[PDB]
Amino acid sequence: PEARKLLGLAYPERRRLAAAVGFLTMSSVISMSAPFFLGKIIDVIYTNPTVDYSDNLTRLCLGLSAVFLCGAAANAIRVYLMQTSGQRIVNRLRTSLFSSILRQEVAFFDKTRTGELINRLSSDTALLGRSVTENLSDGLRAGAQASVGISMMFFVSPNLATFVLSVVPPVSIIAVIYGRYLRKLTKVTQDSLAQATQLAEERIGNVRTVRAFGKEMTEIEKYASKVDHVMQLARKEAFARAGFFGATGLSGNLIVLSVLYKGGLLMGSAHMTVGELSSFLMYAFWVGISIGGLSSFYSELMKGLGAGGRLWELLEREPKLPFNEGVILNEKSFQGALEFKNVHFAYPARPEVPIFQDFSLSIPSGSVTALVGPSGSGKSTVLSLLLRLYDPASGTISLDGHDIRQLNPVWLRSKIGTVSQEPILFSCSIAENIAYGADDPSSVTAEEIQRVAEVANAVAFIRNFPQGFNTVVGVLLSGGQKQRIAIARALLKNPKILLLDQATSALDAENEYLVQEALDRLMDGRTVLVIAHRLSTIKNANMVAVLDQGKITEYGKHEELLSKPNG
Ligand SMILES: C=CC1=C(C)/C(=C/C2=NC(=C\c3[nH]c(/C=C4\NC(=O)C(C)=C4C=C)c(C)c3CCC(=O)O)/C(CCC(=O)O)=C2C)NC1=O
Ligand SMILES: CC(C)CCC[C@@H](C)[C@H]1CC[C@H]2[C@@H]3CC=C4C[C@@H](O)CC[C@]4(C)[C@H]3CC[C@]12C
C-alpha cells in the first residue's frame, strides 16, 4: 500500500520527474568520465613526450572544456526541476490535510491536542515531500558513482582493485556506526539540558510565590546541580568526538600512501603509468564517498515512510457527524418553538459523570424563559446541544415538530445565536471581528458596521483609538468593551433565536450601565433563553424553571413559586 500511495503522490509530476532523471543520468556520466581524460592528458605531457606535443594539449583541453559546459547545464536543470516538484507536492499535502482536519467533530478535538496537529501540518508534510523528490536524486547519484568506480578500477588494474576493495568498505561502515553512536550521546545530553531549562522556566514564571516563602536560594542550588550533571554528561561526547577525529584522519591519510606503495612496485605486464594511478585514486575516493552517500538515503527514506504513515490516517478518517448535509425549511415553517424530551447526556471525556437525565422543556415563540438553578451544574451544555455540537445518549431535540438530526447543521446554526460572558476575539481589526457574523463578510459596507456601533454603545470607546475601527485586537481591551463588541456581531447576524450566558461577577459601574442598555434591543422581538446567575432578570422573565439534579424539578412564573405556601 505504501508504494501505491507514493506512486499516487508522484503521479501529477511525472512529466517533470522523468526529465530530471534524464538530465541526472548525463551529468553523472560526464562526471565519472572526466578522470579517464585527465589521465590521458597527464600521460600525454609526461609519458614519453614527443618533439611537438603542444597541439594535442590544446585540442584535448578544448574538447574537455566543451564537455564540461554541457555537464553543468544538465546539473542546473536537474536541480531546478527536482526542487520544484517537492514544493508542488507539499502544497497539495498541506491543503488536503487542513481541509480534512477542519471538518471533523468536536469530540475528536476533545481527545486530541492542537500541538500534535500543528506538528503534523508543519513537519510531516515537509519530510514526506522531501523524501521522494530531493532524496531519490541523491540515492541515484550515490548508486551511479559506486558502480562505475568498481568497473573502472577492475578495467584499469585488476591487481590493485582487489587490494582496495578490502580496505575502504570496512572503514566506511565503522565510521557510520560511530557517527550514530555520537548522535545518540548528543541526544541524551540535549534531553538533560531541556529538563534543566524547563525547571528554570517554571521557577521564573512564578516569582511572587517564590519570594513569599523565602525560597530564592534553593532554586539556584538545584539549577546549579542540574548544570553540573549536564556538564558531566557532555564530557563523554567530547571524548567520543576526540576519538572519531583522531581515527578518521589517520585512516584517510594511510589509504593514499598504501595505494602509491602498492602501484609503484608493480613491474612487468602489471605496470601502471602516472595517469592510470591518478585515475585509480580518483575512482577509489568516489567509491568511498558513494558508500556514505548511500547510507543516508536509506535513513531518510525510512523517516519519510514513518511520516507518511503518520499522515495517512487523518486524511482517510471519516467524521462521525454529518457536515453540510440535510433538509431545510421555509420562513413560516419555524416559529421558534424548541422542545426537549427525555434527553440523556454525558461528556465523552468523562462518561462517568452524567449531566442530563429525563430532560423535558418547551419554549414557545416569543417567550423569555430563564433556567435559574444551582451554580456549577453545567447547565451551559444546553447551548452545545441546540447547535448540534454533540448528541444525546437517548432522547429527541425537535424544533417545530422536527428532530434536529434531520435538519442541515449549517442552516440551523444561522438561526440560533449566542452571547458569551468572555467573547473570544481573533487577531484582526475591530471591523473584521464585527463582519464575521454576516453571510458574506467580504461584501460588507462600512455603512452597516457604523450603524451597529451606536446601537451597541461601542462608538464611544472606539473613537479614542487612534486608528478608529482598524485597531487590531487579540491591542488590549477591557472586559466591558469585549461584551459590547460581541453584541455588534449578534446585531449584524440578525438571529431568530437567542441563547444568552450571563456573567456571575458584576462588571464595573460604567460597564454595568452601558452593557445593560445594549442588551435591551438584543432581547427585543425574538425567542430568548436566559441562563442567569443572579435574580436581577428573574422577575422580568415571562417564565422561570429550576434545574435540580439534572432535571426540571419545578416550573412556574416568578410569582407562582414565590406565592406558594413553602416560601
Ligand atoms: C574510508 C572512508 C573515510 C571517511 C568517511 C573519513 C572521514 C574523515 N576524513 C578526514 C580527512 C581526510 N580524508 C581523506 C581521504 C578520504 N576521504 C574518504 O572519504 C576516502 C574513502 C579517502 C581515501 C581514499 C584524507 C587524505 C584526509 C586528510 C586531509 C586532512 O588533513 O584533513 C577527516 C577530517 C580530519 C581532520 O582534519 O580532523 C574526517 C572526519 N576518512 C576516511 O578515510
Ligand atoms: C586521492 C583522493 C581520494 C584523496 C582524497 C582527497 C580529497 C578527495 C579529500 C581531501 C580532504 C577530504 C575531506 C576532509 C574531511 C571531510 C569531513 C568529513 O566529515 C567528511 C569527509 C571529508 C569531506 C573529506 C572528504 C575527502 C576529502 C575532500
Paired with 339 in beta bridges are: 362, 398
Which ligand 1 atom sits closest to the C-alpha of 248?
41
* 295 and 234 housed in the same domain: yes
**CA dist list (Å): 370 to 58, 383, 498, 535, 558:** 100, 14, 12, 10, 10
Residue 345 CA from chain centroid, whole number: 33
This structure was determined by cryo-EM
CA–CA separation, 308 and 260 (whole Å): 49
Total domains in the chain come to 2
Strand order in the sheet with 552-556: 416-419, 497-501, 527-531, 368-372, 543-547, 552-556
- Candidate from 285, 286, 291 with most ligand 2 atoms within 8 A of CB, to mutate: 285
- By C-alpha distance, which of 465, 491, 486, 487 is closest to 476? 465
List CB contacts of 340: < 8 A, sequence separation 6 or more: 359, 360, 361, 362, 395, 396, 397
* 148 and 200 housed in the same domain: yes
Per-position DSSP letters for 444-459, written without gaps between them:
--HHHHHHHHHHTT-H
CA–CA separation, 371 and 553 (whole Å): 11
Q: Which domain holds residue 452?
A: 332-567
* 340 and 317 housed in the same domain: no
* 131 and 262 housed in the same domain: yes
Q: Determine the longest span between alpha carbons in the chain, in angstroms.
A: 134
- Backbone phi and psi for residue 498, each to the nearest 5 degrees, phi listed first: -125, 135
Contact 131, 9 (CB under 8 A): no
Angle between helices 479-493 and 446-455 (to 10 degrees): 120
CA–CA separation, 161 and 270 (whole Å): 12
Contact 386, 392 (CB under 8 A): no
Which ligand 2 atom sits closest to the C-alpha of 284?
3
* Residue 96 zone, left/alpha/beta (φ > 0; ψ -120 to 50; rest): alpha
Residue set of the binding site for ATP: 376, 378-381
Q: How far is the CA of 167 from the centre of ligand 1 (A)?
A: 14
Q: Helices in 102-207 by DSSP H: which ranges?
A: 106-111, 114-119, 125-133, 136-156, 158-165, 168-205
Tell me which of 301, 331, 361 is where a domain ends: 331
Core vs surface per residue 84-101: b (16+ CB within 10 A) or e: ebbeebbeebeeebeebb
Per-position DSSP letters for 206-240, written without gaps between them:
--HHHHHTT-SHHHHHHHHHHHHHHHHHHHHHHHH
Backbone CA torsion sign across 80, 299, 183, 309: positive
* 155 and 297 housed in the same domain: yes
Judge if the beta carbon of residue 366 lies within 6 A of ligand 1. Answer: no
Tell me which of 331, 362, 395 is where a domain ends: 331
Core vs surface per residue 446-462: b (16+ CB within 10 A) or e: eeebeebbebbbbbebb
- Backbone phi and psi for residue 523, each to the nearest 5 degrees, phi listed first: -110, 20
* 402 and 528 housed in the same domain: yes
Contact 498, 528 (CB under 8 A): yes
**Cβ neighbours around 259 below 10 Å, total:** 17
**CA dist list (Å): 258 to 154, 271, 272:** 18, 16, 15
In this structure, the strands spanning 394-399 and 338-345 are antiparallel
Paired with 368 in beta bridges are: 528
- By C-alpha distance, which of 173, 180, 141, 111 is closest to 30? 141
CA–CA separation, 518 and 103 (whole Å): 35
**Cβ neighbours around 388 below 10 Å, total:** 20
Judge if the beta carbon of residue 472 lies within 6 A of ligand 2. Answer: no
In this structure, the strands spanning 543-547 and 552-556 are antiparallel
* 311 and 343 housed in the same domain: no
The label of the residue with cell 546539473 reads 75
Which residue has a Cα nearest atom 21 of ligand 2?
289
Residue set of the binding site: 248, 376, 378-381, 501
- Sequence letter at residue 490: A
Q: Which ligand is nearest to the CA of 244?
A: 1
Which residue has a Cα nearest atom 15 of ligand 2?
249
Show the beta-strand stretches assigned E in 15-147. Answer: none
* 68 and 206 housed in the same domain: yes
Query: DSSP letter at 327?
Result: B
CA atoms within 13 A on the CB side of 141: 21
Backbone CA torsion sign across 351, 355, 361, 366: negative
Q: What is the SS3 assignment for 474?
A: coil
Judge if the beta carbon of residue 537 lies within 6 A of ligand 1. Answer: no
Angle between helices 274-311 and 168-205 (to 10 degrees): 40
Q: How many helices (H) and strands (E) does the chain have?
A: 19, 11
Residue 511 CA from chain centroid, whole number: 40
Q: What is the SS3 assignment for 193?
A: helix
The label of the residue with cell 568498481 reads 150
* 232 and 339 housed in the same domain: no
* 312 and 426 housed in the same domain: no
Contact 485, 458 (CB under 8 A): yes
Per-position DSSP letters for 508-564, written without gaps between them:
-HHHHHHHHHHHHHHTSSSEEEEE-SSTTTTTTSSEEEEE-SSSEEEEE-HHHHHTS
CA–CA separation, 553 and 410 (whole Å): 33
Which ligand 1 atom sits closest to the C-alpha of 289?
19
Backbone CA torsion sign across 234, 237, 239, 245: negative
* 212 and 269 housed in the same domain: yes
Q: Which ligand is nearest to the CA of 279?
A: 2
CA–CA separation, 122 and 176 (whole Å): 29
Let me know if 223 is exposed, middle or buried by CB neighbors in 10 A (0-12, 13-18, 19+): middle
List CB contacts of 211: < 8 A, sequence separation 6 or more: none
Tell me which of 308, 331, 354 is where a domain ends: 331
* 417 and 323 housed in the same domain: no
